[model samples]
Target: KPINVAIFGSTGSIGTNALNIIRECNKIENVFNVKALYVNKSVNELYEQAREFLPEYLCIHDKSVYEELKELVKNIKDYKPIILCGDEGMKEICSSNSIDKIVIGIDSFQGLYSTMYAIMNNKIVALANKESIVSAGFFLKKLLNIHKNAKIIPVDSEHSAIFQCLDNNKVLKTKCLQDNFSKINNINKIFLCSSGGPFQNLTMDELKNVTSENALKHPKWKMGKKITIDSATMMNKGLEVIETHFLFDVDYNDIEVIVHKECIIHSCVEFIDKSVISQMYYPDMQIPILYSLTWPDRIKTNLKPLDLAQVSTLTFHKPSLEHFPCIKLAYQAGIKGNFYPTVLNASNEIANNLFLNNKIKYFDISSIISQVLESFNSQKVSENSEDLMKQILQIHSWAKDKATDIYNKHN
Candidate 1:
């Protein structure tokens, strides 16, 4: 039987790589099939992708794209993939048992409900939207347990390594078989690697003068604009730290962010014995993407493999909290817990978008994130999916409005 796969963000970086993987697998032996494709928007690209893959369903969050799609997809009218738009579209594809696996690449909180729905349906989820887990980790994991058949394998290199490392520890591995599965603890530390973004070496004064274009110039890894800016501020790493806790069930103290400029060492794990085991590979986000897809199978991928011999040395350092205010703010929010993490993520996204639009300078990105956090209320933490979902969007909307207004007024 062929493997049927679904991708949540079919046109973005992760989505394109997943499709490439699908194409590669098909060429290898025609063993995998693209059952469903989902994207937030980009109907034109969706039309092109659907035409080639002929998936069972095609979902886009952009409801307005219907007429645009109708215009291009009229020729294949009868055979056109099921066109689903808006938030509910995710649940439709995710909960559907038709597809065997999923690659969640949609960057926004929009993927949260679908992720929950997919887990509830016991679907194999290739987890990529770190914000989903960061904001609603406990609730999401509980849902996954209830579904029984659902398995969430991390697609982030850091989390993926910790997942693999946990498997290697025999004691916890054995305990995992028992019903009281929460008892075992094999991990001592979850060390995350950072390329330190584009401005790691810049002094506080140098960083203050940084511009959006300069910040987006990441040392390595070409990614979405928002994430690239997040990387520059080191907020992405902070969100990952919170995500590391949620994904692996580690505490805040157990999670450490190391400045590994090479990015060859994707991530590391420390056992109780103090021995650290690290997973080193060339910096290709695709490696983790493929890992999430094949998982235990460990099939070959087109991503660049690490070469230890040619790489003579690797360096590590501590992150400068003063230079990057976003990093400190993320940790503060994570520690505070509740809706703070979500608020932090939302504000960062809003501010980064502003920065990218040239509404603010690079340094202003961090300033906006900090100010937005201050403007938002953190008194209440959403207790359920409904409230949680509303909170994220509310935070996002408020942040966007506030940042844009402030930026315009100041300029």
Candidate 2:
């Protein structure tokens, strides 16, 4: 039987790669089936993707695009899909029992509700949304306890690398079976690699003068605009740190971020026995996406294989938090361990958009997050709270609004 898959943010980077993987697999031997496809607004791409894949359901998050999408799909006489729009449509997609795996490629907090809904329904989630884990990780862990069938396999390259390293050694698998599975003490350190973005070597004066266009020119991996901006500020790495903390049950102090310019060594894990293991690949999202889709089972891929002999050098260095304040602020939020991560992520996103739109300078991105984090209470929610999602959204809205206000006032 084929593995039924639903892909959220179908037009985005991760989603597109997942679809490519699905397409690749289908060409040889179809092991995966696209059950549902969703996107926020890329009508043409979504329409074409749906037409080719012929999914059971098609969802457009933006209601305004519904009529246009329907018109576009109507041209294809061979397939008729249950077209859905808005929040309710997304909920319907998440509630489906036929979906064996959900590739959550949607960035930021937008992916949160769907992720929670999917987990509740005992669906295996391939999560790429760092903000979802950063904001409501505690609640997600709680849900996993209730629905043991649901598993969140990280799709981000760094997290995926770490997951592979731990799984290969039987450390993670053995721990999963143990009754006392609270902390992973076997691991000494986890190194998260950062390309350091386009501004890693820039002086303070140089950074202030750099435009959004120049900042988007990442040193290695090609990514979405939002993530590219986040990488420039090193906030994405911070979010990953928080994500690593939650996903692996490791403390913030134990998770280290290294500036690896080569981008070959995806991530590393050092065990308490003084031995280190690392997962390496040629900086591609598809490797992680494929791994998340078929975990504990490896398969052949068409992606270019890594060649260490051709590589010149691999250098590592500590990140300069003074230059990139977002890293420090992320650690602060993660340490606070409550609503701080939510507020931090929301504010940073609002500020990141502002910077990307040329409304705010690169320096102001971290500044806005710093101000918002200072203003918020960073209070922890009760474990038994009935309205966890509502509370998380409230915090998100409050932070976004506050960050927007800060941007408005400063501008």
For model 1, residues 224-249, the per-residue Cα lDDT tens digits are 78788888888889888888766666
lDDT of 2 by residue, 278-298 (tens): 999888888899888888788
Query: Can you list the residue pairs that collide in candidate 1?
Result: none
RMSD of 1: 3.4
**True lDDT of residue 408, candidate 2:** 82
Best by TM-score: 2
Q: Candidate 2, which segments miss by more than 4 Å at Cα? A: 168-185, 217-220
For candidate 2, list the clashing residue pairs, or say none: none
Which numbered prediction scores highest in lDDT against the true structure?
2
- Would you estimate the TM-scores of all the predictions? 0.88, 0.93
